Each structure stands twice: as C-alpha cells, then as structure tokens.
Amino acid sequence: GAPPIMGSSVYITVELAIAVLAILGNVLVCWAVWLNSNLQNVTNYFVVSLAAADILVGVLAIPFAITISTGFCAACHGCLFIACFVLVLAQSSIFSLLAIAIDRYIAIAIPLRYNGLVTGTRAAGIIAICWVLSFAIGLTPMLGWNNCGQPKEGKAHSQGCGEGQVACLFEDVVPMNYMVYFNFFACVLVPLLLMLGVYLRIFAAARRQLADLEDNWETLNDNLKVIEKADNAAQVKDALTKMRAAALDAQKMKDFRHGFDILVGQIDDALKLANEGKVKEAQAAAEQLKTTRNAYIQKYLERARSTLQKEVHAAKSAAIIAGLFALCWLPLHIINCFTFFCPDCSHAPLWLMYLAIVLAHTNSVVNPFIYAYRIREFRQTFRKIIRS
C-alpha cells in the first residue's frame, strides 16, 4: 500500500489546476457581459448566472472536495454542509440551463411577443428564485435526511475524533437514496429530459418555418407561370387568388412594408382586370410582379432565411453547453446508482470515484471556450479585454 499522500497529491494538484481555469475563464465571461452592451440580454443574464456558479465551484466547492477527501473529524452537520454545497451549485446550473432553453424557444416560436413577454427585470427575479430553490434542494440532507443519527463510530475512534464528531466522508453522511431518488432522478434527470424536449421543439419550429418561407416563395412563382400561359380569365383569377393569400400569409421595417404593398397592389389590380374578363392585359399586369419580386420580395426571403439560421446556430450553441453538463455529471450519478442498487457489486474503486469528481469539476472550465468559439460577439469582446 502506497502512502496515501502520493495519490492524494495528484488529486489535489489536478483539483487546484481546474479551480484556476474555472475562475479565470468565467471571470472573463462576466467582464465581457458587463462591458459590451450588445451582450446584455436576458439570455446573457442566465449565462452570467451559471458563470457565477462555475466561479463558486473553483472558490468553494473544489476546496471543500479537497478537505472532504481527508476524512477529517468534524461535527456531522458541519460535514453535511461541506459535502452538499456542491449540489447547490449543480442545481443552480440546471435551472440556468433550463431557463436559456425556454428563452430560446420563446424567441423562435413567438418572436412577436418575446420582447414583451421576456424582460430583464423579471429575468433577474427568476434568477433569485432559482438560487433560493437551489439551496433548498441541495441542502435538504441538513433538514434531517442524513446519516448523522447513526455514526460509523469505529471509524471515528480510529482517527481519534472527539465526542459528537464523525470522520467526514461523503458516502458516510449523505444517504444514497437522497442521491439517487431525490437528487439524480427527480432534480437532475427529469430537468435534463425536459431540456431535451425543449431543444427538439426549437429545431422543429425552425425547420418548419423555413419550409413555410420556401413554400410561399415557390407558391409565388408557380402561380406566375400558370398566369403566363393561361387560357381565360377564370384561371388567371385562380392563380392570383393563390398568390395574394400567399402574400398575406408570407407577410406574417419600412422598405419591407413597401415591397408587399406594391406586390399585393399589383396582384389586386391584375385581379379586377381578370374579373372584367380582359385576359391578356391581366397577364401583362401580372408580370411586373416579376419586377417587384426581384427588387423586394426575395431580399425578404433571404434576410428572413438568414435570421432563422442565426437563431438555430444560437440554439445549437446553447444545446452543446447543456450536453456537456450532462456528459461531465452523469458518470458520478451512474456510479451512485451502482452503489445503491447493487449491494452485491464491489464498490467502484477509489481511483474511479476521484476521476468522476474531477470530471464533474471540469465542466466549470469548458463553457468559456464554448462562447469564444461559437458566438462572435463573445469572442471579439474576449480579444478586446485580453489585448488591453
């Protein structure tokens, strides 16, 4: 048996390394948002919320993890706080991730109302509630759902703890049914599945809005080709009737309104010519539609197409952040599941336990790199602060 202090030294060094990067990179996220007013959205108030969570992983949770791993003697309820605080920060991150996803769904589904419905004063109120909830969920073991009432007292006498003290060890004070049923299933897993559903709807609503754009556009010019080589006023009538409905449908800030005002007006004129039975001047009236289409309607088709692609790109960035949360945190939860559901199994070896803790802490480093690579306003603000 190698002296514990040697493997301890690898663990502590790595933890300290991670804390440094967690703090630095996430202090940069918060500086960027404060400086650049382009970055002050309700979306970014939640990303600053989870940057705060990540900062406190490095300043508090990682120091707590280092000391919990020693088994130091302590009063059991003080042990519980050291051991559970990180669950507060984990829960806060889940709420922030959930909020961002809901915000990005509102953005894409009802852009009309978004600015009305979502505002930075209520966002701040939502964030405070979420932290309070996060202390409640994460510090529930201290309200009585703990193992303090039954100390492993042979382990306490071996390390020579004083009376009322335990050897502070996570799986000794925190019950595993809390961790698996209440923490993992209800408080982590259920919210993640909800996130998964929100993102599914977002990509669905963007995909079928693009289809509706391209449908209305193809409806516009096929009707035109029908008008073109028509026979009577009755068929010209139909293919402008389908154009105008498609115009009003596609319509749903000043040069855009012109473009359609001319378009439906041009249609409307060809319509009455058709009704009065003059076919070929109804045709001729309908092909300067072609002029308005090229000068106006397709710059609308294109910049609307350009904006949906930005919103999907922004929603895929947010999705990556949530996915990396799940990746970094699931192994620990899965190991607790084995520990709890299979008492016939050998406990996961100690080195794997610490690999899983280290991997969960690593999540506190990744997000700043995700912003810098994937959202240009963040990346250029990062550059501006760094060089200055």
Ligand X SMILES: CC(C)CCC[C@@H](C)[C@H]1CC[C@H]2[C@H]3CC=C4C[C@@H](O)CC[C@]4(C)[C@@H]3CC[C@]12C
Ligand Y SMILES: CCCCCCCC/C=C\CCCCCCCC(=O)OC[C@H](O)CO
Ligand Z SMILES: CCCCCCCC/C=C\CCCCCCCC(=O)O
Is 314 a binding residue for ligand Y by CB under 6 A? The answer is no
Is 41 a binding residue for ligand OLB by CB under 6 A? The answer is no
Interaction partner, residue 170 (ligand OLB, ligand X, ligand ZMA, none; CB < 5-8 Å by kind): ligand ZMA
Write the interaction track for ligand X spanning residues 28-67; mark x where CB under 6 A is met and - where it is not: ----------------------------------------
**How many Cβ atoms are within 10 Å of 69's Cβ, its own excluded?**
20
> Using CB under 6 A, which of 18, 42, 55, 94 touches ligand OLB?
55
Nearest to 93 by CA among 68, 65, 117, 57: 57
Q: Looking at beta carbons only, is 184 or 300 nearer to ligand ZMA?
A: 184
> Using CB under 6 A, which of 87, 156, 192, 358 touches ligand ZMA?
87
Crossing angle between the packed helical segments 350-374 and 298-341, to the nearest 10 degrees: 170
Q: Which stretch in 120-128, 200-208, 211-219, 329-337 sits in contact with ligand Y by CB under 6 A?
A: 120-128
> Using CB under 6 A, which of 60, 102, 224, 353 touches ligand Y?
60
d(CA 122, CA 128): 10
Interaction partner, residue 34 (ligand OLB, ligand Y, ligand X, none; CB < 5-8 Å by kind): ligand OLB
Give the shortest CB-137-to-ligand Z separation in angstroms: 9
Binders of ligand X among residues 309 to 328 (CB under 6 A) are 327
CA of residue 334 relative to chain centroid, distance: 23
d(CA 342, CA 352): 17
Crossing angle between the packed helical segments 298-341 and 255-275, to the nearest 10 degrees: 120
Is 341 a binding residue for ligand OLB by CB under 6 A? The answer is yes
Nearest to 27 by CA among 1, 60, 59, 3: 59
Binders of ligand Z among residues 317 to 336 (CB under 6 A) are 319, 322-323, 326
Is 59 a binding residue for ligand Y by CB under 6 A? The answer is yes
Which H helix or E strand runs over 34?
Answer: helix 4-35
CB 119 within 8 A of CB 165: no
CB under 8 Å to 287, separation ≥6 — which residues? 224, 227, 228
CB 304 within 8 A of CB 256: no
Binders of ligand OLB among residues 6 to 35 (CB under 6 A) are 30, 33-34
d(CA 270, CA 286): 6
Q: Please provide residue 73's backbone torsions phi and psi, each rounded to the nearest 5 degrees.
A: -70, 140
CB 340 within 8 A of CB 180: yes
Give the shortest CB-326-to-ligand ZMA separation in angstroms: 12
Note the residues at the interface with ligand X (CB under 6 A): 74-75, 78, 81-82, 327, 330-331, 334-335, 337-338, 341-342, 345-346, 348, 352
Footprint of ligand Y (CB under 6 A) = 45, 48-49, 52, 59-60, 63, 67, 72-74, 120, 123-124, 127, 131
Interface residue list for ligand OLB (CB under 6 A): 30, 33-34, 40, 48, 52, 55-56, 341
